[PDB]
Each structure stands twice: as structure tokens, then as C-alpha cells.
Design a binder for this molecule. Structure first.
Ligand SMILES: Nc1ncnc2c1ncn2[C@@H]1O[C@@H](COP(=O)(O)OP(=O)(O)OP(O)(O)=S)[C@H](O)[C@H]1O
Ligand SMILES: Nc1ncnc2c1ncn2[C@@H]1O[C@@H](COP(=O)(O)OP(=O)(O)OP(O)(O)=S)[C@H](O)[C@H]1O
Ligand SMILES: Nc1ncnc2c1ncn2[C@@H]1O[C@@H](COP(=O)(O)OP(=O)(O)OP(O)(O)=S)[C@H](O)[C@H]1O
Ligand SMILES: Nc1ncnc2c1ncn2[C@@H]1O[C@@H](COP(=O)(O)OP(=O)(O)OP(O)(O)=S)[C@H](O)[C@H]1O
Ligand SMILES: Nc1ncnc2c1ncn2[C@@H]1O[C@@H](COP(=O)(O)OP(=O)(O)OP(O)(O)=S)[C@H](O)[C@H]1O
Ligand SMILES: Nc1ncnc2c1ncn2[C@@H]1O[C@@H](COP(=O)(O)OP(=O)(O)OP(O)(O)=S)[C@H](O)[C@H]1O
Lengths: 307, 307, 307, 307, 307, 307
């Protein structure tokens, strides 16, 4: 959803400070009869403050919408406040307020940051600087690449001198969980954005083949690996393409010894400018088996097990 | 009930400050043997403070009274305090204390104000001035007309540039709910007491015919519409008449394009001084169908639905 | 689903007797690796009997399918037995077994018949002849028209000398309920398929305008009225058209004073052979208001209420 | 309610056999649109059998009626069957069917008989003859006087060689309990309708003064004492009068040493033909204290206690 | 129990300050092997502080004692603190510490004072002076007479210009409730220890005969009436005698028009110095009925009821 | 455990009929003081019948034994009866009774047969002949090889024209479940003990690599595959060896293209007569990768997924 679904602008000494919406003001808005000429204008509930532009009605779950977010939960407020604390430290101007708020961000990524922020064991609970950087990345107001320190978090299922593998807890989310109960997905972040040895790539690749053999190692190109069911690569190919198509934009293919062969092809075809069908095609054909970089990984792990 | 059911007067530097009753002192009073010459005098429980005049015994629910209020709930205290905070800001004199306290007010209206007052999302939670004005109106110590800002509240089911429609939550009240579980009623307040366009009246009327076709649009004449079941107009006619009969008094017929035809007649007959039977009669006859002000409203909404 | 999802054929003295599937045999089948040349052949579980042809896998809900039926419930068995008791009384031949079983029937309609069949207050609980006729109609092996006696049932919300209005209890179904919790739909059956007076049509039409004003009176053309939300007429138009398109077929427009104006147009355009767009178009335009057959109905009911 | 609220007549070999109503047929009826010329005619639900004449709608509790009976409980069926088993043994004729069914009987009295009938410890559970006589008395098709054997039952709180005192369990009834939770009432039946000694009257009177001092000993004149709160004598006086007024009739004043002084006066004034006001008046005046028949009773019981 | 069951002495600047026992130190003590020469000496648990003299083992409930108190409840601590706050304000000396602590007090009376003390509606919650006086009376370190203000409290069932009647809530006590579930007892305190009119005595006596006819009005002679079951007067006679026998002492017969005839006799015989048998005898004989002071009380109340 | 833990012999007309033990007789036995010369003799409880020889005390779980069985569950009885129904159909003689009962059988295998036997969907519920054969195999009184029809059962996770793969439900067993909650194990039975094509072996092998990559395909040599965690092969190697060592014996290596390479080696070394260390050694070394029989299986399944 747009950042304009969580807060509204407010002039306060030349600078713009962002304020969170009360869920009841949103509720009033969803029952309000607005003019087509005001759908893009914030709404005054009179009783519970300002509400989002009524043109975003589809972002909030109601009795006939389960495709939006659960704005009546406390997580909506926590997430809104997180976005506000971030935007407030930018001192946006009377000309970006619009561009900034119309930005679409990942809700699951923000709620995941709230979970990190509130855990006193998480480093984010203690560093407003790290928390800030983590959030700016998520709301698209940063140039940095998400790494382990600034990751959205989740449950750690594998740690290496080079990477940290997380199990995404979207099914358990309060704000906008995933409805498909068969959902399983993992994210691998780079601990440090520096040179990674072969022994550390081999340690990870081995873990991925043995522990997650039914998963395809892909990437959305922003610096982290995404471990998803093969029966889901298609949908990912579509979303990443649609995104690339938005030229109006950098992509990181990541380590080719880790990314699934077909995904690397599909993505390189895309980075070369090709069409969708041309790309998608590559993703389906049983390409020529590349020279396995780390052979034996499977057998070794298997033998260790046997002891 | 009388305001004297929630508090008692107390001289404190020439001015009169009102104090709330402890529920246990009320309980003692209900078991007390008082003299007919003291029924109008406050009662001393000796143990829990001062209690209301024993002549009001019928206002409190007991084992043989369900026609009163649940004074042992916390809502009784919250409501009492609300009344006290209001009266204390008037600095009543040694001659009105009686007149003021003998005033009958709507308990459901006060408990509704407590619910608004305690919600941090409601503007009343932040404006003691607005809260004050809202309460003074309710306890009859104000000249202002209840509008959206100062309304008793409830659940907002429709908002317009001109009105706000609330669903009265009386069934859920702790202090003195409605016992009839088949009860449904809505209130429409004017957002601003100023000139209202036709397009905004049409937006409301359309909503009332489509969404509440089994409801009659009436008014008790204090500036707001009351949406009630047709099978309840009779009782309303009686209560509003009885009230008018109390000449010892202004009435607002409100917009004639909104108020149910028969109700407007019944009320105008009343504002002209007529009798009850003369009025009630008008309310039952299938009067001549007036020239529909906004024709087509029904069909339009219906067609929108179909898309 | 196809009737072949509930039972399988079995030669037994020249005649074909149908046997119900065990849910565990279906489960085995859903885990079975079948050859593309056997997808249309019944499956042997070896342990729990015969299962349906694996080409119907999509009819049964699993961890990745919620678009099918809950075959593990007792209702699956009850429904299967109902279908079997019906087919067994036909003595199908070695040439129809296929045609008969490949017939698609409404599961909600069958489960509704089980609910009637098991209630000792329902006449079906006592007439295997009426139960039979009711089921044959539902499984498409009958020429008769569903009337009140043979209806699928539900909760009776209005009864007339001529019609009976039922509230469809699909949300509560065990076998294949409706997932959309905002679903509300009613069915009106003719008590007797004979001449219906005007006073009895007027009694019904009045009830439909007052009690169900937000509902469009339509029909799927098999002899009964379907009362659905206007925001659902579109989907109905599609399903009825798709069905009509299946020329490889009779349609009953029903009483034109009852069916919604636009639906009658949409359907007559269809009975004339027209295209989809040509028809659908009629359904959206605010046609010229036909001469109201029973005027005043609204006001009368309203006045009765007021007493 | 009328006996016609539980069953309907049916010719079966010159005699009339009564059949119980299905609760669902009653429900259909309550939603049926009947003609004013058929309100007194049984109703055909088409689906659940015959229902009572729609003119009795007020006898059944619905969403807007709590003044009737809970016909959907099993007790409705049990009670209906009890009434049927009784009427069926009378072989009513083609001319009384109406008179018999229009008879108003006490529902609480019948449900009380069902409770006795189903307890294997109660003699009624074993004597269909005694059960029959008990029911005929209750439905007004008998000349006998209710005594201990044929009483409606309840909880036995005192037994004497001459009487049995029962605590009426109406608050616990399923079919038509009493809604006023402050209700307490007892009934005293004569074990044998023969000469009762003074020592046995004294034993009872003593128990009534010591154990039930806040209760007035009255009677509805059908042979049993009714022990009710003094704050309820008024309502009883009205109901017994209204009943007496129905000349279109015998009354038993019962033992004058037991019946409350004022009640005996009120009732004798009634048996003499007087008006209501003339009677009611007697009930309120502090009449001249009659010569206490059994003096000392109080002190004795008190002294026994002290040991 | 002795006050020495709740606290122990401690020299602190010439004065003696009392400290509460930890329940765990009591528990240790109950498992301790003490010498017969130390049974009267406080016990050191080493781990949880000082405990009471092991000679009081019988005051605490254990697995084989239900005749003591539940020292592990919070009420034990609250009660101990109440006793401490009282004794600490006396500044007892190095010669009374023993006499003071060996004093037996009523636990139910103290726990009742804790309940008053903690209720913010009770005046004791606000007056440490009144709380103090109330406690000193209870622990026998005061000359004052318990009146309504300083009563042990309970549920108020009747209030008069002169008296307040309380229902003792011993069954609900945490520290040392009454085990006999059939227990019911009331206490009547004098609001003011001054001249009481006849009309106010008559108001009370009337309430006692009508509302509590099975109760004997007695007194333990310390200024308040005790309303107990006649089947309990005997036990009371014994306890009051045993107490009187403790000459090593003033008694208040109270109003003779209120106290049960026999109790007044039994007590006057005692105040004259007589033996137990001589007294007890008076309590059983059906003495000559004294000239009823307020005749008619019964009939009046009865007549009021009837209206 | 020994079959002598479930029943005892009894001469009845030259033949020996087996009777089940009452759990209470076992309990008595576990508290009985027996002589070392009777430990092998059945025990008479006197009160609950005959119990097992006290030398088997270790087979029953008590307060200090969790290594046995839960003989107090109904499953103990059901299992005992199953064993009895089997032995009774053999008509054992006065010379085998001992040999037969001292036979150790798998309890989990028997309880699994009870679960099949009681399910009306399972073929065993209908064939006492098949049930019999299945049980005789399990208790070691049969020459037949367990196949799908006669398998111990469980949850079917894969079915082929040639095999059926079951998930062992030992964790859920009542009689003697597995305590290690991390336990997962599957069994693959041959549907028919006949020639199996390559396409059907390939279908299975593909399923085993994709769906169970962390599992080693082994066998205990009685005709079925056992799918266990690699971290469990060691324990299996020990149990199968210990068993082989019991020469006082046939082994089926099964299809070498399916059994894990190392397991085939370990087992062939055993079938050749070798020692334990010699065998175990083979199981650990990373043997030379044999020529993959069905290459590509992995990639194909993976590609199918992607569609
Ligand atoms: N309802 C939705 N649920 C999930 N994704 C959506 C939804 N709607 C749009 N998207 C897609 O979200 C993006 C892909 O999913 P995300 O996980 O949100 O991307 P991402 O968070 O940037 O990826 P990472 O974290 O860098 S590996 C595509 O740009 C969008 O097409
Ligand atoms: N127990 C009662 N319950 C509800 N109304 C009562 C009751 N007793 C008296 N009334 C009536 O209360 C008034 C009408 O109901 P209310 O809703 O309280 O009026 P109101 O609150 O002033 O109306 P609004 O808010 O201006 S539309 C009549 O003056 C009284 O007759
Ligand atoms: N999953 C589905 N749920 C509901 N309807 C479906 C579904 N799939 C197909 N249909 C449609 O079912 C038919 C319309 O719905 P139904 O209620 O089943 O028809 P119907 O039961 O014959 O109508 P009646 O009872 O005569 S008014 C259309 O022929 C189909 O397109
Ligand atoms: N809803 C009602 N509840 C109780 N009584 C009613 C009700 N409606 C009418 N009655 C009265 O019922 C009768 C008195 O109550 P009942 O207890 O039913 O009489 P009764 O059962 O004949 O008295 P007994 O058993 O001989 S002492 C009066 O004739 C009626 O006025
Ligand atoms: N376990 C016990 N339970 C109750 N009373 C006891 C117990 N043991 C001794 N007593 C008696 O307690 C006294 C009478 O009971 P209490 O109610 O405690 O007296 P009291 O509290 O002084 O009376 P009041 O309050 O002035 S009317 C007698 O002096 C004792 O015999
Ligand atoms: N407590 C125990 N739990 C499991 N197995 C045991 C236990 N005690 C002994 N065993 C072993 O049981 C055998 C192997 O386990 P099982 O599964 O019972 O064999 P099995 O049932 O014959 O194998 P299948 O069914 O033919 S593949 C070995 O012969 C024994 O060493």
C-alpha cells in the first residue's frame, strides 16, 4: 500500500511532520459519501481526525474486502508510527510530500521491523540509528542495501560467517498476513557486503540442497536471496518483471553459483531488455546442466548425518 | 432520572460543588426506614457517605425493579463524575441547586458521552471545552444545539459533507441499556448548523431509502433526525407530545424533504397547539403522496449496485 | 461436480447398481501416480475400495485446494448415498452409465435434501417417493419442476397460498458451503404449478419490496424465483448465459410482474438467441420505468407497521 | 393457552384423534400471510404438516413476543403428547372438537405433569390411569378435585397425615416459565378428600406461620391452598374474580381456620355475588382480629427449636 | 486466637514495636522439634524470621487441623498488619507486652475490619483515627463501645435513624470462615449511643418480627444486638456464661422490649450471680407471655405489603 | 514383547485355546511376591484371573518403567484379542504352546492391525481371512510376505501401480508408542509380489528423492522398504544384524536400484556371513558413486513443479 494509507502531512515550521491515522477515522471514511473531485484529498471525520484519501478504500479490509489490511489492529498503529518516525527525520518539503506518500511499500516488511524493534534482545531495540536505516530502506527513502543487520527479520534457521537465513513469519502477521496457509518462504541476507569466500558459499549451498531441496534459490535483485517453492517461481517471475518494466532501476543477479540456473537465465534475459515471453520461456526449459561448482556437497552432508 | 440521583450539593466558599454518590450508600438507603417528612432530604448512610433522597428509590434497579439503573456498575460512577465536572463549572447558587438537580436527563445520552470521553481517538478525549459543551447540552444547562462535534456518539454508518449518521449502541450500555433486544435506532446530526445544499440532502435521503427503507425519518425537535422503526413512531409521538405539553419550549420541524410526511404533519399540528387525538390521527392516515423532491434516487443506487 | 465424484458403477444381474466411495480411497487416489491413459478410469486403492477417476482431483479440497468439496465429512457419505438411492431406482444400462455419471449437479442442492430427509418433521422423512422425485430433479434425471414439496429447502421466511420463500443456508453447509461470509440468498418456490391469482402475487411482491428492497428478483428459469443482492446480478447473468449457450434446453421467464425489469429483458434477449454483450447491456441501462402493476404496496405495508 | 395450540383434530373411523403440531410448522405459520377469513382455520405448512389457527400467533414466543410459549423446546412436544393421550381417550365427537380445543388450560400445570410422568420414582410413571385422571383434571375434562395423588407436583417441603405442601418450580420450566425471578409460590393439596382432624390442621397451620410467615394462605377454590407473597394477593384477587365473572361454576372457600382472614372475606363476598370494588375493599381493611383457633403454635415451635 | 499468633515484640528505643510473622516462618515452626522449656518462647526459623511460640500450634490449620486459621492467605498478613498498626500506637511497655499479646481476640471481627479498611467507599478507608478506634475496640485495648461507625461491618440489611443491621459475612472469610454452611447471623449496632425514641425501637422490632421471625434477638452484652437462629441460642448461652465466669467485667442487657424474653431472663439471672443450670433453665421454659410493648406491628407490615 | 504377555493357554478338548489377561490381574502380579522357582509360571491373582509369568514384569510400564507397554489401555485388550483370535485358529498342541507364546512380536505392528481391523473402510474390517493372514504374519506363524493388502497400515502418502508408501503412526499409538517426538518413518509395501516394471520403479525412486531426500531407503529384509532418517541407519544396522546373528533365517536385499547404496553393501556383507565391524564399516565409507540407474528424475519433478 501507499505510505498515504498510514499517515498525513502537516505544516509545522516550514517542515512537514507526518501524523498517524486513527482507525476510527478510517472507518468513518469508508462510510463517507465523497465527491469524485475529492477522492485524492484527505478526509475529515470530524470526530476522529483526518483519514486517508477515499481513493484508497481498497487498501482496508471490510466485510467485502479481505485483500487489504487489518487497520483496526494495534499493529496498524505501530507500523504507522514506524513510518512517521522515519519520514519525520527527513524534513520533507512542500514538493515531495506527494511523491513520498504515494510510494508503495511492503507492509509485511514493516510489521516485521516492528517485531524486531520491540524485542529487547534485538539490536534494533537499542539503536534508533540502525532502526532508522532499516526503515528508510523499507520505505524506499534510502540507497543502502538490506543486509543482516538491517534485515526485516524472522526466524533464523541458518547462520554462516557470510550469510543469515530467515524463515519469513508472514502467516503469523497481524496487519496483513498471507492467507494461503501452505505458504513457506525464506530470505538470505549478506552479513557483510564484502568479498565472500568459496568455503562460505559452499557451506550455504550445501545447506540449501540438503535442507531445502524443494526450494528454488531466486532473488528480487535488491541484494538478498529468496528461497521459494518451485511451484511459486512463476508468480515471482511476473512480479519482478512488472517491477522492472517500471522504467520511468538497478538489478543484482547475485552469485550465479547459488541462484537457480533457470532464474539466473530469466533475470539476465530481463537485464538485457527482453520481453516477458522471451524470458519466461527460459525459466521453463530444462536448460543444459551447468558444471556443478561444488560437487559432492550432498553426499558429504548425508555421510555426516550417518554419524 | 433526576440529576439528584447521581450527586448531592455542598457549600464550599459561597459556591456549590457537586459530589458523586457511593453505590454502597445508595444500597443502605434502599434498606433504610425513612419518615414521610424526609423523603425529599438527602440520606446519611453513616458508613458510605450521603445518598440520594429516598423518594427516588424507583430509579435504582434491585431484586424487584428492572425499570431503573444499574448503580453498582463503574459506569454509574463515570456518569456521576461527568455530571459533577459539568455542574461544578457553573458555580450554581443557593437558589438553583434544587431546580438544577431536579432536572431529568437522559442516562443513555450521558453514558454515551463517557464512551466518547474515554476513547483517545475521540476529539472529546482531548477537549475539555468540547466535552463540557457536550455535557451541558445533555444535562439541559445549555442553549446550544447538539451537532456532530457534540453528539452523544455511537457507531458511524454514514458520513456526508453535511451530516453524520450514528447507530445508537443502547443495547450494549452498562448503566441503563434497553431491554428489548429487537431495538435498532439511528441518529443524524448536522455537521455544521449552516445552509445545507440540495445535493447533500439528496445524498442522505438516497441513503435512507436504500439502506433504511423500513425506518421512518422523524425528530424530537432539538436539531437532529431520529431514524426509527415504523412500528415505533406511535411511542415517539406520545413522548414528544407529553414533552410539548410541558408548558410551564421551542421545536424544530427540520427539513420537510427528509422528515417522514406523516411525522411532519403530526408535529406541525402540535406546533399549532392542537390536541393529541387531532395530531395522532394525522400520523395514521395515508395522506396524499407529496411531490417527491428527489425522484429516481432509488433506481440510481440500485444501478450503481449492479456494477 | 460430476456424479462420478460420489459413486462408481457395478454390474449386478444385467443392471447397474451404484456404490459410494470411501473417503480414504479418495485420499489414496489423491496421492496416486496415475498414467495419462488412465485418468478417466476408476482407481483401485487396494485398501479402501474403488475411488473416482483421478481426472477429478480438482473436486476435492486438500492443502492446496479450497475450491472443491470436504469429502472427509459425514455429509459426503450421506450425499453419496442419496445419489445412489436415486440412481439405483433407475436401473441404468450398459450405455448410459457414462452419460449419467458425467452429469454435473449442485452439491449444495443435494446436501440441502439430506437435511430435509433426516428431519422427522419434514415430509421427505416420511415419503421415499417424494424424496426420490426431489432427488431425481436435483441430479437431472427428471422432467418435473421443483416446487415447494420437492424444493431443496432451507429456512422459511414467508409463506403464501401460492408461494414459499426460503433463505438458503449454504454458509452452514458441511460438504461445500460458500466461503464468502457476506452471502445472503433466497429462493421462492410455487406451492402448486397451477393458476396464481393477482392477490397472491401482490401479497408476495409487497413482501419483496418491503422486506427485501436491496434484492433483485431473478430466476435461472427452472420454475423458481431467486432473490439475490443487486451486487450479484452480473455473476448470475453470466452463469445463466453460459448454461443457455450449452445447446448440444427450455427456459421459464416466470411472472413478468415479479422478475426485476432488467432481468426479464436480459433473459428475453437471451431466449431470442442474442449474444452476451447484447444481453448484458440491457441489464445495466436504466430502462423506461414500466407501469407499476401493484401500486401502493409500499405505503400500505408501511401504514400497517405504524399500528 | 387454548388446547388448539398443541394439536389438531382428525377424523379416523367416526371418532376424533388428536395429533401434535411440529414446531417447524408453527414457525412457517408465523411467517404466513393468511386471509382474515381463515384466521380460525388450521394452517397447512405444506412441508411440516398442519399448524395451529393463525389467530393464536400471540401464544408463541418470537423475536417480539416473550409473553407466549417456547414451542421449539422438547417440552412443547412432551406436553402436546400428554394432551393428545388424554383427548384420544375421550373419543370426542363431531360437535365438541371445537368446544374442547378452545379450552384454555394452564401450561405450567401440564409441564409439571410431564415432569412427574417421566420420573420413574413418581407413581404416575407407573399408572396410566392416575396419569390420565391427573391430566383430564388439568385440561378441564374431569369432575374430580386435584388431590396429592393427582397434583401437578413440585418439590415437597412439608408432609402431613392430611396434606402435602409443594414448592412450585415454575422458574425452572422449559415451556413457559415465570420471568420474574423473585417468584416463590407453594401449593397444598389434600392427601385424601375426607374428614380432617384438628390436630392435623394445627400441624399445618403451625408450619405455615413459622416457616412461611410472609405468605398469605389463599385458594383459587378448586380444592387446594395456594401459599403466596402478601405482595401478590391483589393480582390473585383479580384473576379469581375475572374467572368467577365468567358465568356462561363452583367455588371452595376451604377451611376458614387456614385461609387468611381477609382472603376468606374477599371470597365470601364474591360467592355472595358482590362487585369487585366491594370485594377488593374487604381484602385491604385491617379487619377485626378473629379468635385465634390454635393459639400458642408460634411459641411451641420456637421452643422446640431452642432444643 | 492470641494476638501473639500474628506478631512478636521488639525493643526499639525504650518502646515496643510489633512485627508481623511471615507465613513461611510459621510453617517452619510447625515442623520444628522444640523443648518443653521453650514452648512459650518465640521461635527462630533462621530463614524466614521469627515465628509464634510453638505452644500455639493448634491455632494454625494444617493437614490435621481445620479448627485453626488459614495463615498462608494474604488476609493473615493484612490482619497482622492491622493489629500491628494498633499496638504500635500504644507504645506498650516492658511489662505489658506479655499481657497484651496473650489477649484472645475475634479473628472474624478483625478480617471484617480489613474489608472495611480497604473499601474506598467506607469511611474507615479515610479515617485512620476511626480505623484505629475500631481496631482497639476489637483487640480489647479500648473502653469505647462498638457502634455503627466502629462496627465490624458486613452487608447492611436495614437502617434506621437509630440502628444499622448487618448480615455477618463469615462464610465468605479467607482467614477463618465458618465451616457450617447453614450459618446465618446478623448484628445490630446503635448509630449513636444516646436516647432512643419509641418510634425508632418500634420500627426495628417490626422489621425483626416480619423479616426475621425465626431469629432470636440476643446480645453478648457489649452494646449490640445479635440476631441468631433459635436453634443456636443454647451455644450462645454457653459462650456468654463461660465469658462471664471469667472474673479475675460489665454486661449490658440492652433494651428489654427488643431482647428475646427468655434471653433477658437468662442474662439477668447471670448478672445476679447465679449458676449455669439455674440460668439455662430459664432459657427453656415457656415463660409467661409479657405484655407486648408494640402490638399490631405484624398486621401493619402485612397490610402494607398487600399494597 | 513375548506373546505370553497378552494371553495364557488353556486345555479345552485336546486343543489349546488362548485367553486374554485382565489388566487388573497384571497389576496384582506386579505387586506379588513370587518365588524364584515360579517366575516362569503363570500367576493367579485370585481376584482378576490369571496373569503373565512374573519374569516379564519389565514388559509393563509402571511408576519406574516407561520402557514397557501401557497395559491398562483398551488397546492392550484389543491387541490381546487379536492375538487370541489368531492363535485359536491354529489349534496349537501340548508341545508348542511354550514355543509359540515365547515368540517376540512387534506391538506397534499389532496395534496398527487393530486400527485397520476397526475401520469399516479398510478391507480387513470385512475379511477375517485377510485379517487372519495379516496377523499370523505379524505374530510369526506364517510363511507369507507382508504386502500392501496385509500391511500393518498407516497413512498412505504415495501409491503406485506397484507400491504403496505408508507413514508410520507410532507416535500416536496407545499401547506402546515411540517416546522420541522427533520420530518419522515410512514403509513401502509391494502391491503384488510379482514382476515390477522399470517405469514403476522409476516413479517411486523419483518420489523418494524429491519428497524424502533426507531419508535412506533401507529394508529389514522381509519384503518391504523402510524409509528412515540417515541419522538412524546405524541403529537399524545394529538391530538387523543382531537379528541375523540369531542362527538357531532368510533375507531379502530387495531392488538394488532403490535401496541406499551403503545399505545394500552393509546387508550383502551380512548375507555373506561377515562380522559386524566389517559390515558397519561399509555403511560409513563414501563408496564409489554407482552408475545412476534413473538419471534426471530430480530435474523432471522440479520442472513439473514449476508449472
Ligand atoms: N498483495 C501482494 N502480496 C505480495 N506481493 C505483492 C502484492 N501486490 C504486489 N506485490 C509485489 O510485491 C513485489 C514483490 O514482493 P516483495 O516481497 O514485496 O518484494 P520485496 O520485499 O522488495 O523483495 P525483497 O525483500 O527485496 S527479496 C512486486 O514488486 C509486486 O508486484
Ligand atoms: N424509560 C424511558 N426510556 C426512554 N425514554 C423515556 C423513558 N422515560 C421517559 N422517556 C422519554 O424521553 C424523551 C424521549 O426520549 P429521548 O431519546 O431521551 O429524548 P432526547 O434524548 O432528548 O431526543 P434527541 O436526542 O434530541 S433526537 C421523552 O421526553 C420522555 O417521555
Ligand atoms: N463453484 C460454483 N458455485 C456456484 N455455482 C457454480 C459453481 N460453478 C458453476 N456454477 C454454476 O451453477 C449454475 C448456477 O448456480 P445454481 O444455483 O447451482 O443453479 P440451480 O441450482 O440450477 O438454480 P435453481 O435452483 O434452479 S434457481 C450455473 O449453471 C453454473 O455456471
Ligand atoms: N400469563 C398468565 N400467567 C399466569 N396466570 C394467568 C396468565 N393469564 C391468565 N392467567 C390466570 O390463570 C388463572 C389463575 O392462575 P392458575 O395458577 O393458572 O389457576 P389454577 O392453576 O387453576 O389454580 P389452582 O391450581 O387450582 S390453586 C386465572 O383464571 C387467569 O386469570
Ligand atoms: N472457634 C470459635 N468460634 C466462635 N466463637 C468462639 C470460638 N471459640 C471461642 N469462642 C467464643 O467467642 C465468644 C463469643 O463469640 P464472638 O462473636 O467472638 O463474641 P463477640 O465478638 O465479642 O460478640 P459481639 O461482637 O460483641 S455481639 C465467647 O467469649 C467465646 O466462648
Ligand atoms: N523397544 C524396541 N523398539 C523398537 N524395536 C526394537 C525394540 N526392541 C527390539 N527391537 C528390534 O525390533 C526389530 C527391528 O524393528 P521392527 O520394526 O520391529 O522390525 P520389523 O517390524 O520386523 O520390520 P519390518 O516391518 O519387516 S520393515 C529388531 O529385530 C529388534 O532388535
Amino acid at each position: 500500500a501507499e505510505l498515504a494509507c498510514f499517515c498525513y502531512p502537516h505544516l509545522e515550521n516550514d517542515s512537514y511532520k507526518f501524523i498517524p491515522f486513527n482507525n476510527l477515522a478510517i472507518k468513518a471514511m469508508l462510510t463517507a459519501k465523497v465527491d469524485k473531485k475529492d477522492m485524492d484529498k484527505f478526509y475529515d471525520s470530524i470526530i476522529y481526525g483526518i483519514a486517508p484519501p477515499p481513493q484508497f478504500k481498497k487498501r482496508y479490509n471490510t466485510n467485502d474486502n479481505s485483500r487489504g489490511m487489518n487497520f483496526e489492529t494495534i499493529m496498524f498503529t505501530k507500523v504507522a508510527m514506524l513510518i512517521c518516525e522515519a519520514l519525520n527525520s527527513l524534513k520533507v518539503t512542500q514538493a515531495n510530500v506527494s511523491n513520498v506518500l504515494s510510494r508503495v511499500v511492503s507492509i509485511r516488511h514493516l510489521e516485521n521491523l516492528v517485531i524486531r524493534k520491540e524485542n529487547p534482545q534485538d539490536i534494533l531495540f537499542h539503536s534508533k540509528d540502525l532502526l532508522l536505516k532499516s526503515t528508510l530502506i523499507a520505505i524506499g527513502q534510502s540507497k543502502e542495501i538490506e543486509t543482516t543487520i538491517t534485515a526485516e527479520g524472522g526466524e533464523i534457521v541458518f547462520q554462516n560467517a557470510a550469510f543469515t537465513m530467515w524463515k519469513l513469519t508472514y502467516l503469523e502477521h497481524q496487519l496483513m498476513p498471507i492467507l494461503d496457509q501452505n505458504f513457506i518462504e525464506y530470505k538470505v541476507t549478506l552479513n557483510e557486503d564484502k568479498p565472500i569466500s568459496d568455503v562460505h558459499v559452499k557451506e550455504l549451498v550445501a545447506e540449501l540442497r540438503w535442507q531445502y531441496n524443494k526450494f528454488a534459490v531466486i532473488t528480487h535483485g535488491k541484494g538478498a536471496y529468496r528461497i521459494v517453492k518451485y511451484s511459486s517461481v512463476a508468480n515471482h517471475a511476473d512480479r519482478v518483471y512488472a517491477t522492472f518494466k517500471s522504467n520511468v532501476n538497478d538489478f543484482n543477479l547475485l552469485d550465479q553459483r547459488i541462484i537457480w540456473q533457470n532464474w539466473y537465465a530469466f533475470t539476465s534475459s530481463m537485464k538485457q531488455g527482453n520481453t516477458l515471453d522471451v524470458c519466461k520461456r527460459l525459466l521453463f526449459q530444462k536448460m543444459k546442466p551447468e558444471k556443478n561448482p561444488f560437487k559432492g556437497l550432498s553426499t558429504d552432508r548425508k555421510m555426516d548425518e550417518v554419524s
